[PDB]
Paper text:
pmcHuman ornithine aminotransferase (hOAT) is an enzyme that catalyzes the transfer of the δ-amino group from l-ornithine (l-Orn) to α-ketoglutarate (α-KG). As a pyridoxal-5′-phosphate (PLP)–dependent transaminase, hOAT has a “Bi−Bi, Ping–Pong” kinetic mechanism. In the first half-reaction, PLP and l-Orn are converted to pyridoxamine phosphate (PMP) and l-glutamate-γ-semialdehyde (l-GSA). l-GSA is then prone to cyclize to Δ1-pyrroline-5-carboxylate (P5C). In the second half-reaction, hOAT catalyzes the transfer of the amino group of PMP to an α-keto acid, preferentially α-KG, forming glutamate and regenerating the PLP form of the cofactor.
Author numbering: 38 to 439
The structure:
């Protein structure tokens, strides 16, 4: 099992919907990854902020092993003993009345849109099937037909058939645009990411989230905050929106909600929106299973108990300050919050972000390019200062070797 054979096996038998970086990973622990050759790598992608707590965190692994021997799935046709405990825990932690559990982020987004439409028809009084949902340009919340229907990325939706009606798109970080869009009374919700991760970690101006909250409240529009990637202490707070002390109507969570051990996602909102969905009107087979509930409880407990948010804040300050010392000769921009950061490099004929990531892999650091000039830096939140500093040294060497 060399790296080449693993690549060839995936190429021969698997679909070609991805072009991963040529690394064949076989072990993971905390912040480190090991390939089949035994090489050691710094993980600076964190599986898209899903292993914020580190790879194979002992407390989450123990919870999964304890639950797997007793009960893993009953389906929602009956009750299990774990779901209610997790629901109470999460609802108290994030200060919302109810949580609707799902498995993946796309499912939470679909649930959020369904909630928005049902609330618009039943509570707001919009005439049926005229309800609109507004999204921000550069948004990403998955690859379902509805999700790509709201994407501004041509690779996401080009050639994928007719698209879901009722979706409007406005520029990100543009309060006047949202105000103008909300003049349509048929708007039911505005869905937005506090920081657009897939777009290249674009950070809105301070006060943007406050303005969005005020505009949504003024025009009775549901504020949907997609914190699947930004939430759970990655940006330095429990939710990135806590930076502006803003309370969205709906909160989406996922990925790091399980520490990478299980597909678990959640839709958090109060009774006045959640109870528009009557029994038998929405659900999922694996949504709310006891195994995922135990895993999510363990994952959130290690986040709270290890103060990963505060460490993320301090270490992100250091990371951005060090990355800004990089010459504008190569690094055109540095941006981010907490340990969700990105650098935009000057792409030329000589080099691009793909080559930078290849050389970073050669030097023991794993990162992925998302635009051809944008490189993501997102190590697990359990990093210590010295590990971060030596990772920064690796990044400096790779950058200044071109
Ligand atoms: C990752 C992502 C999703 C989709 O999550 P999946 O589990 O891959 O379906 C949704 N919203 C945001 C902001 C994301 O980063």
């Amino acid at each position: 099992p060399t790296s080449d054979d693993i690549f060839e096996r995936e190429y021969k038998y698997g679909a070609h919907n991805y072009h991963p970086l040529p690394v064949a990973l076989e072990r993971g622990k905390g912040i480190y990854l090991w390939d089949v050759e035994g090489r050691k790598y710094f993980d600076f992608l964190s599986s898209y902020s899903a292993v914020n707590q580190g790879h194979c965190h002992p407390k989450i692994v123990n919870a999964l092993k304890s639950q797997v021997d007793k009960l893993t799935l009953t389906s929602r046709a009956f009750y299990n003993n774990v779901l209610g405990e997790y629901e109470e825990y999460i609802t108290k932690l994030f200060n919302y009345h109810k949580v609707l559990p799902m498995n993946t982020g796309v499912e939470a987004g679909e649930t959020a849109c369904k909630l928005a439409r049902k609330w618009g028809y039943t509570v707001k009084g919009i005439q049926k099937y005229k309800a609109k949902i507004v999204f921000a340009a550069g948004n990403f919340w998955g690859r379902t037909l509805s999700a790509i229907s709201s994407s501004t990325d041509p690779t996401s939706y080009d050639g994928f058939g007719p698209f879901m009606p009722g979706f409007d798109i406005i520029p990100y970080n543009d309060l006047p645009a949202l105000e103008r869009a909300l003049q349509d009374p048929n708007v039911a919700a505005f869905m937005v990411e506090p920081i657009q991760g897939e777009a290249g970690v674009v950070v809105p101006d301070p006060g943007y989230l406050m303005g969005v909250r005020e505009l949504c409240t003024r025009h009775q529009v549901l504020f949907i905050a997609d914190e699947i990637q930004t939430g759970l202490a990655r940006t330095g707070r429990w939710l990135a929106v806590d930076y502006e002390n803003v309370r969205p109507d709906i909160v989406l969570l996922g990925k790091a909600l399980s520490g990478g051990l299980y597909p678990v996602s959640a839709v958090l909102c109060d009774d006045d929106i959640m109870l528009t969905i009557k029994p038998g009107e929405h659900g999922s087979t694996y949504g709310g299973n006891p195994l995922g509930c135990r895993v999510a409880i363990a994952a959130l407990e290690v986040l709270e108990e290890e103060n990963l948010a505060e460490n993320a804040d301090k270490l992100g300050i250091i990371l951005r300050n060090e990355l800004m010392k990089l010459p504008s000769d190569v690094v055109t921009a540095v941006r981010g919050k907490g340990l969700l950061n990105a650098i935009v490099i000057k792409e030329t004929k000589d080099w691009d972000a793909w080559k930078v990531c290849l050389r970073l892999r050669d030097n023991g650091l794993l990162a992925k390019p998302t635009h051809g000039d944008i490189i993501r830096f997102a190590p697990p939140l359990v990093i210590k200062e010295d590990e971060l500093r030596e990772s920064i040294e690796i990044i400096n060497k790779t950058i200044l070797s071109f």
